[PDB]
Amino acid sequence: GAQVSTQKTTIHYTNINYYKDAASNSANRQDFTSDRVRSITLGNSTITTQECANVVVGYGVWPSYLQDNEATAEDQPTQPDVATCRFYTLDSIQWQKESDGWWWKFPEALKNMGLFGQNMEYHYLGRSGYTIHVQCNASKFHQGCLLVVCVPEAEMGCSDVEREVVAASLSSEDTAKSFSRTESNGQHTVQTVVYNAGMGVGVGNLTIFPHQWINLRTNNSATIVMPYINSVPMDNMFRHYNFTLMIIPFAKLEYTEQASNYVPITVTVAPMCAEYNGLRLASHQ
Amino acid sequence: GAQVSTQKTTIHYTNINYYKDAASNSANRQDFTSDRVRSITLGNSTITTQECANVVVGYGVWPSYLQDNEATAEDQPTQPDVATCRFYTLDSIQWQKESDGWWWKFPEALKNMGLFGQNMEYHYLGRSGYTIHVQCNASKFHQGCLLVVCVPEAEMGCSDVEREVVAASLSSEDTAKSFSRTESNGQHTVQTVVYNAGMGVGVGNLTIFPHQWINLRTNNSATIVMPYINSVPMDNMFRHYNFTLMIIPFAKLEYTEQASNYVPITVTVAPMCAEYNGLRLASHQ
Amino acid sequence: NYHSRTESSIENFLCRAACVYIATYKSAGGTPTERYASWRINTRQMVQLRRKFELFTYLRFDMEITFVITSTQDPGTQLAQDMPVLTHQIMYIPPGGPVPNSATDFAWQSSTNPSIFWTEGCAPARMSVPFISIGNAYSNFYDGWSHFTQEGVYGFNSLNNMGHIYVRHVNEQSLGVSTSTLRVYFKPKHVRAWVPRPPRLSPYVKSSNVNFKPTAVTTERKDINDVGTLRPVGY
Amino acid sequence: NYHSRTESSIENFLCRAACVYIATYKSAGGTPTERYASWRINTRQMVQLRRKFELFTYLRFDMEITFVITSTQDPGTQLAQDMPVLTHQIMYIPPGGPVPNSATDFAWQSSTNPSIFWTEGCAPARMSVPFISIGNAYSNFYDGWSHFTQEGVYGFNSLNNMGHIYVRHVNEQSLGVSTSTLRVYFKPKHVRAWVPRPPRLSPYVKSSNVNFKPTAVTTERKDINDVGTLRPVGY
Amino acid sequence: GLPTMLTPGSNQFLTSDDFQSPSAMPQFDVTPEMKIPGEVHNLMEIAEVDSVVPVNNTKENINSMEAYRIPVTGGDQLHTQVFGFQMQPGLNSVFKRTLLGEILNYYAHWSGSVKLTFVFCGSAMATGKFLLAYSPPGASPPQNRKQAMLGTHVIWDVGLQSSCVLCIPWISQTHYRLVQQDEYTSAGYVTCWYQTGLIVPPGAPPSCTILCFASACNDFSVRNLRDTPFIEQTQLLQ
Amino acid sequence: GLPTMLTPGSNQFLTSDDFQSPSAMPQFDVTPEMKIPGEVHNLMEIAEVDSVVPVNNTKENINSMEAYRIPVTGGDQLHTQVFGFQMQPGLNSVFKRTLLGEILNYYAHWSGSVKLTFVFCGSAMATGKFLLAYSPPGASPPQNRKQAMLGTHVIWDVGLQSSCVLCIPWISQTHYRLVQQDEYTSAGYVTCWYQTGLIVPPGAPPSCTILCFASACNDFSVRNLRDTPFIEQTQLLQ
Ligand SMILES: CCCCCCCCCCCCC/C=C/[C@H](O)[C@H](N)CO
């Protein structure tokens, strides 16, 4: 009551709140001023990245548990620390000259690997942070570049307008969907053009989301420690994708005549501090 | 004057009363945080209920007198403590297999018993709390249930619309009116269907009013100590019913071939602290 | 457990203004009952407020009455061509007062009565009334007769003695004919509610007693163990 | 370096009222859907506000809704000749409430609903609404299906459950016929914005999903080393 | 005088307001206060009192009183399901006219733990065990006892105690679920299965009747207010 | 009562206001606060993240992905200009759909220092030097290396380091230059020239691809707010 402050040019302003609701006040609009390599050992499967390589820690935050301060569940059964933390390796996509790009959808891309698809198949809720590590074996005469990006909530538009999308075309089971350098003509598939990144945004503007570059000159691999990002604290993993990887080569790979032409790319994700709630004797499928 | 308080989300509100009337202010909308059996001996007639049985004490309050703090009468003649406190026993209704239900209207159901119908026949005003105790003799092979409820101000709708009700059909003199499991076709009688409880409400929703269960498995009797509930402190007992008992069997009684088939039900009310005012040499009828 | 109730209180459940009456009164000569519009003060006319009151046996509150008086133009001939603003007069009549037979009567002075004059195009007129009864509570249910010999009316229609609101126009309207509609709104505050009681399952049929037709308990489902739908409504 | 940012804040970028809906409703008998005008509460109808919201994934704000309700006169015959002011009623319907089928319905009492009556020739009507959702943030993008077996709708059209604003006239209009248009404005305040994301390059085509046609990145210039113009456009 | 400016919101009639107003009966004293018992403070105290739920709500039964009595026949079944219902306190036919439902139907959002207490009305000598299991939304309704056992459950011995109570837990993605529950913000199925089979001696009738009482636990809350879609009218009734 | 006077400005609806208003949902509690990561405070934090700029924005190339890859062929050139563009962050085709441009296009005035970081995507063995020079508006665009050398420039050794960064300086007559730059309040041309010529060994491919990242330096500011002339609509889309 009877407050006095400053304004952006003595000069002041005395505004009072005449209402009994916090959402009825005005807007605030004022500020009060042979060699050494590191080895991540998580679960029982290690990696070897580099000594000199940076590791991007998500949106600044490390993946952590959901404390009692911000829980809305009723009862909380156990979360495993060894059983689902291993560096699970997915299928190896093959990089060629005219390769467009690849994507994944990770809450529905680990359903077969280990017990991570054997805990979320029973419990109703779910929460896990991820530690993606994508690698390609380099050489000094194999120029080319790569961009990885973990876009969260990557709503993808359908190929034909006034249609929805189908779950068989949005995600795949073990394979990464290609990113046609042209336009898909499908009636129910996804609009998978590469210069719009599926969501309709400019594909150069995918650098806000945690991103790393796998430039074949000065980098061999890339590791993004993505945190669990969702509005609700807990949501089911079978009808919701938390984020989406996108591996789009900005510069095509150009080898020479007497050089290898079967350069692979693997992804080696690992769920960190995976929590579950609501055990129901379901056994989903 | 110049008050400051909190609102439901620093943030406050200063509201002043600009008027000289208490009913002109705004709404408040803010909070400032062989075996042992008990024997009730009342008057000169006892009962024997159980050691383990609960007794429901009305709407929380015990029946008490009307003190000088809240009296609006002119002169207050005497109230008896022995003459009208006995456990008066009414007529015994007979429980069969397809028995629908029974009700009473107690300020006009004790007019013949004792002096309780010989004090209220003379005095103008009246006030009494009641101590209903309904019993049925049990056995281990006589499954069935019962619900008693003392609904206050049980306005009952007539059988035919755009009609009133008649006093001969609303209450009875010594008998309990049945609750047709079907619909009454009368032109002036009461709408006495059992799945609407007379008042038109759902008969499952009679559990707000002080209620007790006479489940034949785990209970032999039931005792409700109802208090005097009325807006005006004193009103005449011949043109006003304070409340209404309703004995509705939710589960029908199912005996076997070699078992008794004449299970009775009695009600044994007793007025507690009955007060009277306004002696007029009337002798009503 | 930190999910306490604020909008479940007895205030916020009952401090909302509900429409109680819909009147209609013209402004022409002939048929003098069409000029004014009388209303005995019930709460039992409209259902949307009646079910909220008939959860509790007794009540005690202070009220905030408001009126959205709107008017139209009646068809035909000899219309206004041009028309100044027309003001309305709302008069309360206490129980036992003289009522006007028609418009332009002798009794429209209202020396004691709390009349209120309202102009069109403004905010709706508002007044506060206190807990006004002879009893200690507005009883919503009166299981008892009027006379001591058990005749007369039966039910709640013996302690509802709150008089009438008689509304009229106060312009002569020399040229045209135009009706107006009155919509009374009751918003009880400082509410106290005693002795709760179940909601009315059957529909309402009258404003004099608790007449009703015997209705079913709930709607019907398929079986005893029907869980509804196992998959969506498609396929 | 003393050029700090004040008008680049999350407040001043989003504390500006944008138009969200354009309704139209008449005031005559016949075709009862033309009397009222319903609107499920999206922000996805108008583009000018939609692109400002779809820079951030989640949001949380309190809002200030305003309506500039203007009306015209419909052509033809039997016109008013003279006409008093006509008032409008704006009713919010919560998710899971009874909606009116037409005008002069039984359900226009709005005992619980926060209706607001507005007269023409005044200031535009204004109200504040808090952060109202079951979740912790107004999610602008929901990459997930409705049902756990991966059918139903897909996209943001599963957590947009905010009910509808149903507007009507409350005058009978005995003589004439006259439409009115409703223009809803949303001005979110106390805004917090999480997880930024790129602007939509392609044009919008739908209000149900993120459908789009594959557009070019930018416009075309002449060569790789085109500096535009070396002299002005003359000569 | 004071040069005020009329903000938007002038000359309006918002219903859910709190404004002062002049009095029509000035200096009018009231009748003094009396202590009528049962002064309720909050509406949710009506939703803490048990009201029988019409569990056998079949088409023929609803009109009759026999919609509140759930059959528990005695014999060797071991597969029969005594009852099952989606635990939707607002839309479900079972709970909508019950007291918890009627107060809840007034309020748009519901958050809390419901308690169902199933009394046994039967001969004293009868003895049996029943498994009542709240299966969370998960996948499909329990169809055999082995399916029900996994979900939270209570084994009740009818003989040892009548009136076993199950406090259905609040496990939900959101703090509040809409009373008009959709597939999203829905609630799990609740079911009851025979564990041993009722054993009734020769002298007592084999059939017995079990009834269901539903009242919210202490932690129940409502969030919005709306018209009840249960009562209606046509004209000004006179 | 108080004899106020209604000033001009009464009964108006100025959009960019800050007024109080009564609440439509009174006493409505909210869901409690959660810490979603990435809580941005100011919009300019999106204009501090690099976004690739389509430097090769030719007519055929823009539709294709090959508009972001700038050619750096290996051979003896010593005159070829790899790229040149007027440094107009708002209107220029090169920077307008980039993240810096999109936030900037919302705001009418721009003041600060842009940073262009040019990464080299090429074989490890490749080595070369490039001179990137910001020539201020002065007179005419640089057309030969000797002309570019005078203006501020950085020599980048591709072999020693990839990702050389040029922070284009803010030299301007006015504190703020309009996003729709005119001849007045315009900005100088930026150009890149070969210094030594890329030397790629026999085992590696001669051609290489260089990409450009543009993000504002810390000292960037916006001054006004306006409609974006990039997105439009026709009707109420349904
Ligand atoms: C401003 C002029 C009109 C003034 C009208 C006088 C006040 C209105 C009467 C108050 C109504 C009291 C609330 C209800 C009373 C009865 O108990 C119910 N109708 C029960 O049927």
Ligand SMILES: CCCCCCCCCCCCC/C=C/[C@H](O)[C@H](N)CO
């Ligand atoms: C004054 C009467 C009308 C009251 C209207 C109720 C408040 C308006 C609803 C608030 C809208 C919330 C902001 C956006 C919600 C959803 O997240 C977006 N539509 C996402 O599509």
